Amino acid sequence: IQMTQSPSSLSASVGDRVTITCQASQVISNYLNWYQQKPGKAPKLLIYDTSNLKTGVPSRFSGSGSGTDFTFTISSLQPEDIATYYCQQYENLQFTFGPGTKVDIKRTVAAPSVFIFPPSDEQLKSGTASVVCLLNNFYPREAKVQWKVDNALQSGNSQESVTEQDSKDSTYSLSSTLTLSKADYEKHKVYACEVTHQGLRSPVTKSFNRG
C-alpha cells in the first residue's frame, strides 16, 4: 500500500558495513533514487536509477535491487555519514519519499567536560535569571544533570537541549538551563550542577557563589 524502509534507525560502529532496505509501493518503472539528509541540511541525491552514483559521491556508497525491493549500502561507515537516508520513487505521476532511515554512530564512552554560567547582569536588570550548565563532547547521550541551590535539589525549573551527533568525533554536547525570577535567584548563595555520566568515575559538580 505504501513505501517502507527498514530499519527506521540503526547504530553502527565506524568502519561497519551498513545495509538498509526500501520497498517501493509498486513495481517501479521510473528511477528509484536515494537521498542523504544530514542534520540541519536539505537532502542531497547520492544514487539515481537504483545503482548510479552522482558525480563526486564517495565510492563507499552503492545501491541495488529490482522490482519493489531495493537496498542502499555503505561499505565502510565514516563519522561524516550520520544522516537520514530516504529512498524515492516516481509512480502514478507523483514523487513519493520513503519514511527514512536514521543512521547513528556508536563509539566508545567519552567523559563530558562541564562548565557553569551565572546569569548576565543585563538579564537580571530585566527580572529573570537563567543559570546554564554545559556538558561538552561526551558519549553516550544519556547523562544525569541535577541542579542544587544551597544544597537543595531543584525540580520543574530546568530544561535541557542536546546537539546532534558531531560529524567528526561522534560525540554529543548538552545544555541545562535553570530559570528563576530575579527575586528567587537572590534568595540563595550557591548554585551548582552535578553531572553523572558513564564516562565519569564519580559525579562531577561545578558551582558558583552568588555575590
Partner: protein, 219 residues
C-alpha cells in the same frame, strides 16, 4: 553552477495564504530538461512533494494538496513560486525548492538534482517576537557563549566573530518554553590564555522580527 534560493514570509496566519518564491541562478529556468518543484518537511517527519512546474507553465501536483496548491513560473525574473491556500497548523514545515532533471526518449525519467536551503514556515495566530541576547561568561580550555531567549517563530541563526570562529562551536537546538516562546544557546570552547586578549562576538539573526544583534562576550 545551478543554485536555488527560497524567499517568503516566516509566519502566516491560519486560513490565509502561504506565498514562497524560489529564484534560480547559475542557469536559466527555461531549460527543456528541467522541472521545478516544491517539497516540504513537517517538524520531525519525512519529506512530502507538493508539485512541480515546467518552464512552459504546465504543472503537476500531489493529489492531497492539489485543491489548495498553485505553482507558477516567471521566466523573466528566472523564478518559480508556490501559493498554498487555507493554511492550518498542519502546514507548518520547512519548504524546499528543487530542480528536477528529466531524461529519456521513450519514457521520461526523473531525479531531484539541486535543492535550495529551505525556508521555515510557521502557521500561527501569534505576532513575531525578537529575542533578547545575553552573554554566557567564562569563569587550559574555557567555554563562553550566548543565550538567545524568548523568540517566535523559528528560526534564529547564530555565528561567532562574523564567521571567523567556527572551531568548537555548538549551537543547540531551540527548546519550547512554558511561555510558548523559543530559546537556545550557542557556546564555543577557546584557549583560556586568549581570554581578556581576544574579543569574541556572537551575531544573532532573527529574520521574522528583522533582528540583527551583535553581543560582545567578555570574561
Amino acid at each position: 553552477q545551478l543554485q536555488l534560493q527560497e524567499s517568503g514570509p516566516g509566519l502566516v496566519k491560519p486560513s490565509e495564504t502561504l506565498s514562497l518564491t524560489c529564484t534560480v541562478s547559475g542557469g536559466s529556468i527555461s531549460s527543456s530538461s528541467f522541472y521545478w518543484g516544491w517539497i516540504r518537511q513537517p517538524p520531525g517527519k519525512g519529506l512530502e512533494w507538493i508539485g512541480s512546474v515546467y518552464y512552459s507553465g504546465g504543472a503537476s501536483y500531489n493529489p492531497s494538496l492539489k485543491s489548495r496548491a498553485t505553482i507558477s513560473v516567471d521566466t523573466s525574473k528566472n523564478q518559480f513560486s508556490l501559493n498554498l491556500d487555507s493554511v492550518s497548523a498542519a502546514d507548518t514545515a520547512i519548504y524546499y525548492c528543487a530542480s528536477i532533471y528529466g531524461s529519456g526518449t521513450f519514457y521520461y525519467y526523473f531525479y531531484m538534482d539541486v535543492w535550495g536551503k529551505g525556508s521555515t514556515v510557521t502557521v500561527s495566530s501569534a505576532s513575531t517576537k525578537g529575542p533578547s541576547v545575553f552573554p554566557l561568561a567564562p569563569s587550559g580550555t574555557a567555554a563562553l557563549g550566548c543565550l538567545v531567549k524568548d523568540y517566535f517563530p523559528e528560526p534564529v541563526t547564530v555565528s561567532w566573530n562574523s564567521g571567523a570562529l567556527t572551531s568548537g562551536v555548538h549551537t543547540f537546538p531551540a527548546v519550547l518554553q512554558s511561555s510558548g516562546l523559543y530559546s537556545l544557546s550557542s557556546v564555543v570552547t577557546v584557549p583560556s590564555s586568549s581570554l581578556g586578549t581576544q574579543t569574541y562576538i556572537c551575531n544573532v539573526n532573527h529574520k521574522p522580527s528583522n533582528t540583527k544583534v551583535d553581543k560582545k562576550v567578555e570574561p
